[PDB]
């Protein structure tokens, strides 16, 4: 029904560990594509995500796997992502890689500033279940995620 987003990808997290689509299995993940040198948009989105994560865990006991994937592999090295993310929620994990690896990941999710606007929610089976745009605020975004997590049932 929804666009066939997602698929195999191979990246590295900001600590150097391999991270592929296989790491999405067994949990609800929320992915955001952006870049450290993005003005306004990306900082604002990551701030909103931090609010969501804290509300989710404290009020509903829900823990997501938040991932920040860079679209600028030229400058966003693991060290740059670690420093950039130090100003945001600690659970957010930055992912990067070679131009080819990043290009593929972006292609799989059909994804610079004007288009770094959706959060992609992936279920425990690694399937795309919903995208949260800027029209979701600190409260309605949480409501939508809770709905998906609590109603989830495996294959």
UniProtKB/Swiss-Prot annotation:
Signal peptide: none annotated. Present with 2550 molecules/cell in log phase SD medium. One of its GO terms (cellular component) is mitochondrial inner membrane. This is Protein SCO1, mitochondrial. Keywords: Copper, Membrane, Metal-binding, Mitochondrion, Mitochondrion inner membrane, Transit peptide, Transmembrane, Transmembrane helix. Belongs to the SCO1/2 family. It is found in: Mitochondrion inner membrane. GO terms for molecular function: copper chaperone activity; copper ion binding. Its main location: mitochondrion.
């Amino acid at each position: 029904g929804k666009p066939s987003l997602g698929g195999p990808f191979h990246l590295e997290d900001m600590y150097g560990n391999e991270f592929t689509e296989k790491n999405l299995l067994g949990k609800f993940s929320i992915i955001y594509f952006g870049f450290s040198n993005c003005p306004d948009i990306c900082p604002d989105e990551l701030d909103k995500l931090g609010l969501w994560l804290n509300t989710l865990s404290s009020k509903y006991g829900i823990t997501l796997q938040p991932l920040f994937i860079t679209c600028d592999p030229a400058r966003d090295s693991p060290a740059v992502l670690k420093e950039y993310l130090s100003d945001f929620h600690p659970s957010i994990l930055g992912l990067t890689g070679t131009f080819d690896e990043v290009k593929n990941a972006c292609k799989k999710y059909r994804v610079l500033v004007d288009h770094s606007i959706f959060f992609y929610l992936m279920d425990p089976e690694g399937q795309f279940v919903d995208a949260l745009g800027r029209n979701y605020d600190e409260k309605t975004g949480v409501d939508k995620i809770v709905e998906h997590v609590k109603s989830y049932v495996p294959a």
